[PDB]
Subunit: 145 residues, 12 copies
């Protein structure tokens, strides 16, 4: 076993609401099951977390260090542009991470072009929807096994 932790930032729980025509058929829950199954197939243990509170996410990352997590896949969402605390949490624990965004962040408002995490991440994926998570997982698996 070699645990991988997936973290979802604020507002991701909004999943899929008013489904036709607001780019949300699938729900976070759907994304998590898919990921757990994908990890399940490669004999790797995988946990997922989400919260709208920054502190909750930071506490989770610390817990991850004590639990021997080898790699974090994180979609910080809004936090990417605002939280240095989150960056320090990932740096302080020294667990390698991949940053994931569903939507293309560079196609949005200018303040969305700045990240406190990207420069320290192994790699980033943006705009490929939920597949982005899958791709990150696939990479993370090769990296360990």
């Amino acid at each position: 076993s070699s645990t991988i932790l997936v973290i979802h930032g604020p507002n991701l729980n909004l999943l899929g609401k008013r489904e036709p025509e607001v780019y949300g058929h699938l729900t976070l829950d759907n994304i998590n099951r898919q990921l757990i199954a994908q990890a399940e197939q490669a004999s790797i243990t995988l946990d997922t977390f989400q919260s709208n509170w920054e502190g909750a996410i930071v506490d989770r990352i610390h817990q991850a260090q004590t639990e021997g997590v080898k790699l974090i896949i994180i979609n910080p969402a809004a936090l990417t542009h605002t939280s240095v605390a989150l960056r320090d949490a990932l740096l302080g624990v020294a667990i390698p991470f991949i940053e994931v965004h569903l939507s293309n962040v560079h196609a949005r408002e200018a303040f969305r072009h700045h990240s406190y995490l990207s420069d320290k991440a192994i790699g980033v994926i943006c705009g490929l929807g939920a597949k982005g998570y899958s791709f990150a997982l696939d990479y993370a698996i090769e990296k360990i096994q």
Copy 2:
């Protein structure tokens, strides 16, 4: 759907705590009671919330979607200049909102000129004190009818 939610941001709980003026007497509770009474008088049901925690406010606005809420009157206070998460929360639930500030924010420090919420709000009131909330409420009432 004909319920109105008022949200107060961080540090608003400190209103009225230092005895007399500058800006004494008046409390957050005082403001809440006036607003509830105003909403009753027009036979509308008004709910309030205050928290110093960003996540708590974000969760509340999620709850607001599930409940009846038609319009949100929010004084994000400090969060206005820092929180894109709050902005995505309001945007993600698609509930229309009015931004209120007690003091003239343009009159203070330059960093206070910038807002992550103003461009998406229906309107903004700043500098009129507690009346600002009342004015936002009056408009909100004439928007449902």
Copy 3:
């Protein structure tokens, strides 16, 4: 002889001379009568003024000081971003004012963010249409007491 003065900036005379799509029928005169009536109900005298010339507005403000105007409600419109002469006029006469905008300025072009008047106004209302003027008057009446 007039206790309250309302000032409308350039291009406001065009209200209601557009469409049935792009704006309805509300005109600047309609707004003025509404305000005059509101003031009369509270036994306060109200005077109004509009011009597309900056110098006419500056002269009006000077005249206001000789006439004992107690408060000024102003929608500078475009002038808000450009005229420091208007700011120095309001400052020079020392008459307190409230700034009003029909549309949400923060909503539009980046250059619309800056104002030469906001930091010196008692308060500002933007994005609530004509009601903003009423909200400002209501506040000014309370204050006139």
Copy 4:
């Protein structure tokens, strides 16, 4: 009755107030006659206006809507860089316009690169002297035939 309106901004009246020093012999009046003639040859009415007061120009644009002007050719001169009130006047009346400059603005002081009207114009011509006005007219005529 005036089908196409030509507006000259501030200081344009000074044209030809000297030998071949700042410019050559040509005057604003010369430019106007050439333009009227060019319009007459194509069976199109053409009116002209110049002022050193921003408010006079703003008033003229408003008058232009009531009469039924279909296109405006404007050399704002100095105002291009300063007046958003002029921009709002052109936008509020919804009359398409072409911006013309006699001299190359991009070859002078850095501030002269900024314009409150170019992004909203159909096209712009600068640096081609009086001919620029002629080219704009030729384009305006084909647009309207």
Copy 5:
């Protein structure tokens, strides 16, 4: 008929209006008389102008060229920061000018540091009150015989 022209910008007319010690007791009119007397003592004709309208000032400068004015002393006041039209008027007539301010402009708001006239003035005086005008006149008289 007048060798030197003195121009006062917007809001200068207000000098000495809030008499008991806000601005002090000195009026524009007083400054003008002192200036007229000083020029008379040197056998030089002096004329003065003030307006709150930018276009009136621009028209006056033009008139100055036809009247053979040799030097202009101007206190543009607020316009110094906003009007390129004024700058172009002074440049277009090619009359040398000295810029004067009653208060120390570098003392106040950052926006007041920027001037559309200074780089083209012969010289600038700020923060010396009315004397500044007197000093400029003294210099102008020596420059001319």
Copy 6:
């Protein structure tokens, strides 16, 4: 291969390759043929060139000097914002030029505002489609004499 040369920058070949509104009927060749005809009518020879490669365009400008080209009309397209080598090419040969753009550059992305060739051109035309090329030529023909 003398007299007047017209240069088209990268992506200009695609003109009219799209039949539908995100283009139109007109193609680059069409424009070229109209311009050659317009020049022939005035007894002036006119050559044309397009390339997607910056070096090819630079080489051609050099060639133009040897060939005794008197004026260049250029639409650098994307190169306007990025190529100082093109600016130096035009400057190095010392052949006066007119810059032309089909679309209104000022109405698009902020990065488009900047140009490495506008401040050195005689003049610039943007936003008037193909007619812009024709106006520049017409100007170039009157200048030769």
Copy 7:
């Protein structure tokens, strides 16, 4: 059926030219064979191209429109920061594309933070090495059915 084109920018050819110390030993060709195979396994045609010349890449992109290419995977490399011509080419043809980089660009110099392409891509992958191209293809494949 529909085709997939992969484009590599300048310097990519160098992959595998100073092999040690386990950083750069896989070659561009290796990557190309893996991608082809990946495509053939899903029965999609795939073509590849590399050049150090911007104009060559731009010509290929045009060529791609004629050939009915449905999607493009591109690693613009250095070009990503300098070439608006490349952006315009992809935009002009209207072929959707995915941006890929072998290294995390955000972890290097600041100037590498800026991209002329990213805002318009469907998505971007940076910092996952060669797997980034493969992930882009799998997404592309699923896109075409």
Copy 8:
């Protein structure tokens, strides 16, 4: 009796991670003990708090005002650069505070140079490790007595 409160920021709980030098053996607990002893020796009551949640820290500060704390020694850590809410909390309660950083913040990333607290603190110490807290304490004691 007399209370001094020491607030530790997010990620501070991680002190003491890989023990023989990434950082040292020293823990937050250790620091807390030294400080408490130091205060006891001077007959001053000292409380400590740490949290990874910004709201938690904000309430604690609110609690401090009710509790009669006379001075706060805070290490905001990451929040220093991001939380105006924290600044307002300290300002709202009106308790004087000293800012402490273990590491020289000006020796790291540019984004760390900026602080929302420093300008309002009595003083600041950075880069002296745990001693920084002690010095702050020592200063605090002399200040109340």
Copy 9:
């Protein structure tokens, strides 16, 4: 002792050294002599000082406080844009000062638009040559007497 102190900054000693039509014939000593005479005529003592060393100037200003200097007229020359130490010296002693420049600083390099002293000076005079010093003295005399 000395009532008024005049300080000249670096390179002022060069005045009148490139004797032909550069500078003029006027030297720093000549200016000093004129100023000393002007002061004697008004029964005021005046001292002067020049140095190319910043520390020497700073020391001189300190000495000035011990000597009871009422007002300082200073031409910092090149320092005005670089020396905060000089600013702090003038501020620390609390002696009011007038800033003077022989040439129009706004007519030169952009970096010369910035001053570490101007916002704190009573007033500034630039571009009037040596007379600037005399004007500053005249104002100083009236301020004292």
Copy 10:
């Protein structure tokens, strides 16, 4: 000889001049004596230096290298924002240093936030008055041990 060198920058000599109101009765001499005594008590030798001339301080730093100074405590005062030479002097000799300021610099002018020294210092203290020097010394002593 374990030596520590304390450097004081320009304007520090002024301490304790304006005796009763603005700042207190403490002088530079007092501070130096308290520091020497502090060092003597720990059996460390301590020299001190002050100058208003940048070069003198630079020379002093060079001498220190020769004298085997092990650490430097510096208050550069105004030179912190302007002197790269001071920075290079400290770096060139490779003697570690601590930066000290008596007042809170971040609380003063925006230009005072910038330092040429901070990023290279071991640590920095500001706003704690003279104690700040004592704290730095205490730290230095423990460091040399």
Copy 11:
């Protein structure tokens, strides 16, 4: 033994085409012969290259490496301010290089101040005309004994 490669950028070939002074007489060939002769004397092989095409220069740099070039002297000319691709080529091959410019670039237009190659060059020479090339070679010879 091995070789030194001299690379010349766009527009260099134009050297020597206006007499006598727009930097007349000297041609790119003259310079090349001078450099070849200088190398020969020192028994070092030297090749040269010039192109107006970026890709040609990039290709040559790749080709330089396969042929064991030890040092490159390059005058990128205009490319210095735009070409990251050129930067990556030199970096990818890992061949040290010296940057040369005939004219003083820092004099030139501000954009001309920036370089994508200066920070990575061994050294840079600018403003010394053709000698600059000779100096670099001289340096290159001693370096490559």
Copy 12:
């Protein structure tokens, strides 16, 4: 007669500290001697000067004019980024100069990119060590004859 002056700025005297790693075994005197000899070989008189005091350098430059120096080779070191006085000294005496730096400035901190001298120098050499001085001298010698 003819003399070339070489000037060295602050911290240059330290050349020769730590012979194996930081620095090299060459000393300022070493260089000086090499330059004097080089000048002798060419029958030119050469003087040198170094100081850590800006004023000293400025005074030397003044002295140089009186002495008929014809060209100055200066390494201003840290002063290049901070001293406008140094620039005005070189400009005021009107002696042409070459700027030299031992290390590549462009390879260090961003603030080191800016120079107050570079635009006014004949040329600049950087990053070539001591040789840079020699190259400047060689050029200076041909320039004289």
